[PDB]
Structures are given as C-alpha cells and as structure tokens.
Design a protein around this nucleic acid. Sequence first.
DNA 1: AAATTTGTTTGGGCGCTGAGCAAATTT
DNA 2: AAATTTGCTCAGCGCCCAAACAAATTT
Lengths: 98, 91
Amino acid sequence: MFEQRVNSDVLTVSTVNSQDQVTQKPLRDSVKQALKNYFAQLNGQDVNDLYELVLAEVEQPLLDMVMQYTRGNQTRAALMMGINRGTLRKKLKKYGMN
Amino acid sequence: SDVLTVSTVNSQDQVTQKPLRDSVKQALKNYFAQLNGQDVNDLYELVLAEVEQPLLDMVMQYTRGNQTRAALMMGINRGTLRKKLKKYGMN
DNA sequence: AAATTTGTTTGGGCGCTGAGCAAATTT
DNA sequence: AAATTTGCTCAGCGCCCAAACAAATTT
C-alpha cells in the first residue's frame, strides 16, 4: 500500500512555522485567514455580497491556471474541471480571459 | 482597494499582505506539478469544496449560528445555505 | 486532408429563487 | 408577551447542461 493524502492536503500553500521551517498548510486555512481579517476591517457596515466576492477571487486564478495548462484549449479545460464547455466560455468572458 | 488578503512573511521577518487569489494560484501551480500528467477529472467541485467549507465555517461562526443573517450576509438564499450546510454535514 | 477545436443555437432539467407558513427559539 | 429564526413547501425561471452543427485551426 501507499500513504493517505486527505482531501485537505491536495491543494496546499507553503507556510513558515514557529521554528522558521517551511511546512505546507491546506488552502482551506488561507481562505479562513483572508476572511477573519476581512471581518476585522468592516466595523460595522453591512455586507450583502460575501459569496460572489469570494467566488470571484477564487474563480479568476483557477481559470487562469488551467488555461495556461491546457494552453488556451477550452475543450480540454472544461473537461478537466468537470464543467460544461459553454459554462467555461461564459466564465472566461466574465473575467475578460479571451 | 482589495478586501480578500492573507498575511505573508519574508526573509527579513517582515509581515506583508497578499491577495487570496495569489494563494489559490500557488495551491494549483503546485497541485499540477505533483501529478505527472495524470488526467484531472473534477477540479471544479474540488476547489469549490475547499473554499465553501472555510467560508461557511466562518460566517456561520460570525453570525453565531444565525442562518438567516449569514444568508443575507452572503448573496445566497437561506434554503441554498441549508442545502450547502447539509452537503458538508456542517448542519 | 483528417482530426480537433471553436463558436454558435436549442431544449430539457435542475438549482437557486422569494414567498408563505406553523412551530420553535431568542428577545 | 413579541419578535426573530427556523424548518418546509412550492411554483417560476434562470442557469447548466449535452447534442448538433458548420466553420476555423491544428495536427
């Protein structure tokens, strides 16, 4: 057999820890921190947009990175993301990536 | 002019702010490196699930479990919010 | 020149939607 | 005692979707 890699550890970013040593925390925790400091700020005006705000911030990179990987090939991009080719096209247009 | 950002630290022990989107880029850039052309199959539901959980975990914690307010705080329908809490068994 | 991708358009369905409501809970 | 939030239902419609095609591009 070979060792377990939980869903958390598939997508990870490099962090430095207490002992000045480069570990790899999940992406989850980056999202957590980005939000917790976002809350620190907004004292105390209302929010009516928090989902789309995040979605936007996450979709742009994903599309970006996959389109680099597939080298502009939308057919393959949409295949590997598991979305409709039309849906992908629509999303690319939302972010001016065409 | 940028709401979503994570704290980073450098060579000179200086903390500096960088956007979450840059952090997502790396996460993937890395993920891609690890697989040597092993076709990826559901990369959207993957990333979605890795972001929806922290987001929910947090606003649900901010609104103190008040589903009504958290749904209004995000852009989404209370019913949708419930469907998502179910999806990740957070309910 | 064959194979693949792009850029449309079409229609079925499912997912997100607000509204409505009684019951439970917070105030 | 009143106000808010929950849990559920329910049409409507808006998005996601595969299927199909011809034209453009890549192989």
